[PDB]
């Protein structure tokens, strides 16, 4: 009697509560599957063309490099692009063997110890293979067909010795450039599919860069496309947007040049403004060495501008003692929180950690004239908004978010992660309709899903 209804109502009410729980997870949107992240997607690269000048004065052996890695992993790089160390006497075809290392650099047993010590810190060594790295023509002007097989035979030897990729430069100087990059990407991937092949080109126009990437879609192509951006970064919004639509938003390296530093192309006021941009664009930034402290090929007399000397401390340049100051060194910029070395260690921290900067999407919207801004977003993680002011004035950014999708649309406030110029408080929320940037200031704003 009394036992009838009240258990039957629980028999109704439990299914009255299960009927909500069984449809709510069906109405809710689910994740899409993460892309298979290879090891170079997970951060930046770092090029060392000259081991003799990275540490200096006869101590440029491969054996002395092992003390530098705990500095070099504080930058949180994910690769290391060591220069051409094979034995090569310049402009001489028969006297160049890519199997044996020049004894000025060390020996074979010193290099194998370097690869082992780099695996403990999760750093992958990418060996350069430019065959004539001392002549002005890099690829042995005559008899080009055996130097193709000299690299093809040496693509097996260093791959069975434990290098983690390869890099060739100046592929505008050999004939049949699009076909030779097809045989070597096969060998480098057919051994294992977590190896790399970074090609390098000097051509700045877009129509020669797409012709290399139409055959192979799995190589990085570093070039000087972003190099001639302008006097004050004039065509930077135009060059970044038009290149990403030319490839259909694929994966691609982002670097100012194939071998040179940052300061061979930019004024010193635009260095902190490009290190913010090169980390947050959808690709692997490829820095050269010295681009984290603002090394300058000028402003020091008696310097080869192809390979400058790194400034570790004030004792780095003994040839001219009064040249190197106390704010131009690695030691002098490590404790200064407003320096340029701290910016490279805060941005490469965010590039390796967050998932929007890792493999999110890219949608740049309209703004005021003279400034560049874009959004970064994965499915439901933290969203990122970069605003770069390329003008020499204090423009107020008028952000017109009228073409963004509904999953990634702008909030009314977003808190400031870091700015490239001191003068704002960090972490506090910041309004978007009244932004009012400074001259040559860049901002990094974050905001959650909230959709």
């Amino acid at each position, epitope marked *: 009697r009394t036992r009838w209804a009240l258990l039957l109502l629980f028999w109704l009410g439990w299914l009255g509560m299960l009927a909500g729980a069984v449809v709510i997870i069906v109405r809710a949107p689910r994740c899409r599957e993460l892309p298979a992240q290879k090891w170079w997607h997970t951060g930046a690269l770092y090029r060392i063309g000259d081991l003799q000048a990275f540490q200096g004065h006869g101590a440029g052996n491969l054996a002395g490099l092992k003390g530098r890695l705990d500095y070099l992993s504080s930058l949180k790089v994910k690769g290391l692009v060591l220069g051409p160390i094979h034995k090569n006497q310049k402009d001489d075809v028969a006297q160049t063997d890519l199997l044996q290392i020049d004894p000025n650099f060390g020996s074979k047993e010193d290099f194998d110890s370097l690869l082992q010590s780099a695996k403990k810190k999760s750093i992958r060594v990418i060996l350069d293979l430019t065959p004539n790295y001392r002549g002005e023509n890099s690829w042995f002007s005559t008899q080009v067909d055996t130097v193709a097989t000299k690299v093809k035979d040496a693509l097996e030897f260093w791959l069975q010795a434990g290098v983690d990729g390869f890099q060739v430069r100046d592929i505008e100087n050999l004939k049949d450039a699009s076909s030779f990059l097809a045989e070597w990407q096969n060998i480098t991937k057919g051994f294992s599919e977590d190896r790399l092949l970074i090609a390098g080109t000097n051509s700045s126009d877009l129509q020669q860069i797409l012709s290399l990437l139409e055959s192979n879609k799995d190589l990085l192509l570093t070039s000087s496309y972003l190099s001639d951006s302008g006097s004050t970064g004039e065509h930077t919004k135009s060059l970044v947007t038009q290149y990403l639509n030319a490839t259909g938003n694929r994966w691609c390296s982002w670097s100012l040049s194939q071998a040179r530093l940052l300061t061979s192309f930019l004024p010193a006021q635009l260095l902190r403004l490009y290190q913010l941009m090169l980390f947050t664009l959808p690709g692997t930034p490829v820095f050269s060495y010295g681009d984290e402290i603002g090394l300058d090929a000028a402003a020091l007399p008696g310097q080869p501008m192809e390979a400058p000397v790194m400034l570790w401390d004030e004792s780095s340049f003994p040839d001219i003692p009064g040249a190197v100051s106390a704010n131009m060194t690695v030691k002098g910029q490590s404790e200064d929180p407003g320096s340029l070395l701290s910016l490279f260690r805060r941005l490469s921290d965010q590039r390796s950690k967050e998932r929007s900067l890792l493999h999110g999407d890219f949608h740049a919207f309209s703004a005021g004239p003279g400034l560049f801004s874009y959004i970064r977003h994965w499915d439901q993680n933290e969203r990122f908004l970069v605003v770069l002011n390329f003008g020499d*004035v204090g423009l107020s950014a008028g952000l017109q978010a009228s073409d963004l999708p509904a999953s990634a649309s702008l909030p009314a406030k977003a808190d400031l992660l870091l700015s490239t110029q001191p003068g704002r408080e960090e972490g506090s929320p910041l309004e978007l309709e009244r932004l009012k940037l400074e001259p040559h200031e860049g901002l990094l704003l974050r905001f959650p899903y909230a959709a």
Partner: antibody
Amino acid sequence: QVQLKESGPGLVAPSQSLSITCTVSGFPLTXXXXXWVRQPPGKGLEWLGXXXXXXXXXXXXXXXXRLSISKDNSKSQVFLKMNSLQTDDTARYYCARXXXXXXXXXXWGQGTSVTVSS
Amino acid sequence: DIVMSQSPSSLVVSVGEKVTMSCXXXXXXXXXXXXXXXXXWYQQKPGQSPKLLIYXXXXXXXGVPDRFTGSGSGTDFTLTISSVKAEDLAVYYCXXXXXXXXXFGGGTKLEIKR
């Protein structure tokens, strides 16, 4: 040489729109930002806005509601739309030329003496 | 909004008397990341369009005579004519070369004693 020809002065009835032109020569229009400057006679200078190759305006808050800067890329001239002209709009309307985001108006216009009355 | 206040409203000098005119900004016109002062100096002859003389507070424009020297930083600026000529009778203004809303100066009329 850098020449910025201008329409010359125009007379209009009150609360009628005005479009002023700033036809140029001697430089590519898409590579430099063209600004507009208001000056009443016997008084100080006032700044109005900017333009670009993407038709992106940066207006001033005192004169944002009744000004609409436009640029015709074909004939290489820019336009400035007046709206609801009150009697305190009788002034000269200079159209200068600044470098790509520097705000240093080097080559100025010739001047248009807008005079509004019935 | 930066406010520009040009100090002498009207001055009168004779030919070759080394005139100076002062200026003062409300907010500081020195960006302390590049340490370059941001102020401009225009010249308006009577009945003519204005003409740029000095940008970034000390860089004379191309085609300007060397009598016009401008110096100072912070919130004080000064345009100096070394020795005025007969044709330097004009009105001199002040801009704000680093701002969203570029507020111009008040104005200063230069007469000539004879």
